[PDB]
């Protein structure tokens, strides 16, 4: 049919980034310029592809990952970045081929008490490989000392909470991100454009 971006962009709940969510897009036609010429996007990057001249392309598969992060962390959803997000949460590969679309969602994700439902991994023995997705909750061993399931100095609960309130700084405000990566395979294209 006509690929359902509205299902991913306009969706009610968005994942915490550490458990980011991915919908697979296939066998339809995508009008990328309803999005391009949309507004209320604060970031519309693209890589290895041009942001105009999108409906000129055909692909085997498109993947839309999506999650919430802070303002100051959008620069980390990009090839070659480092930071608690790009390292421990969501890693774009150096050879990325897709688009990074983000917008401010203060007025949806920040309760006045502060919405602590949005989480992000703050510790990890090693970095994420690209598009790898870690959702374990096992206590982080920072020292030489086995933690045996317990919290305390050098023994940390891995996940952390965002302090999402209005009248935070704009870079501490909740942003909703969507990363579209395109796959070209020895298969025939399924997603194209009018």
């Amino acid at each position, epitope marked *: 049919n006509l690929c359902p971006f509205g299902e991913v962009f306009n969706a009610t709940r968005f994942a915490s980034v550490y458990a980011w969510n991915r919908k697979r897009i296939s066998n339809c036609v995508a009008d990328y310029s309803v999005l391009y010429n949309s507004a209320s996007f604060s970031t519309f990057k693209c890589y290895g592809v041009s942001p105009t001249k999108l409906n000129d392309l055909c692909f085997t598969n498109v993947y839309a990952d999506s999650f919430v992060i802070r303002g100051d962390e959008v620069r980390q959803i990009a090839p070659g970045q480092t930071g608690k997000i790009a390292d421990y949460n969501y890693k774009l590969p150096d050879d990325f081929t897709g688009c990074v679309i983000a917008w401010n969602s203060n007025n949806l994700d920040s309760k006045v008490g502060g919405n602590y439902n949005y989480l992000y991994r703050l510790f990890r023995k090693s970095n994420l490989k690209p598009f790898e997705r870690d959702i374990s909750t096992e206590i982080y061993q920072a020292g030489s000392t086995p933690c045996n399931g317990v919290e305390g100095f050098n023994c940390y609960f891995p*996940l*952390q909470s965002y302090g999402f309130q209005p009248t935070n700084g704009v870079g501490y405000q909740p942003y909703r991100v969507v990363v579209l990566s395109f796959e070209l395979l020895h298969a025939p294209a399924t997603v194209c454009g009018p």
Partner: nanobody
Amino acid sequence: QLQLVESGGGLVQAGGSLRLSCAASGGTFSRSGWFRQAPGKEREFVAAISRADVGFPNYADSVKGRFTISRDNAKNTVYLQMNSLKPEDTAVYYCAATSLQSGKYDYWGQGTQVTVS
């Protein structure tokens, strides 16, 4: 600056059921925990729980089954129901919260004695 104020220990017969409490005045943090320090020994972990999921709770093995941590996001308060107590439980119980920034237990209550006989 965020403050934790605990309320209510005391003396209990072997078998009793105290309830400890903690009010976090005018502040914000991600995880709350209870720790005990016995006389002579080194401070030890009891249980914690975080702001979003009353499905993220951790307990020391020596209290599993018997203690329960409780969160009340309304009143900004954490509770520690203690059941089936034993003299091994005799200690001073500290409440603590992890800073939103460094995810470590940085903010502490002032302890409260619990004695079991």
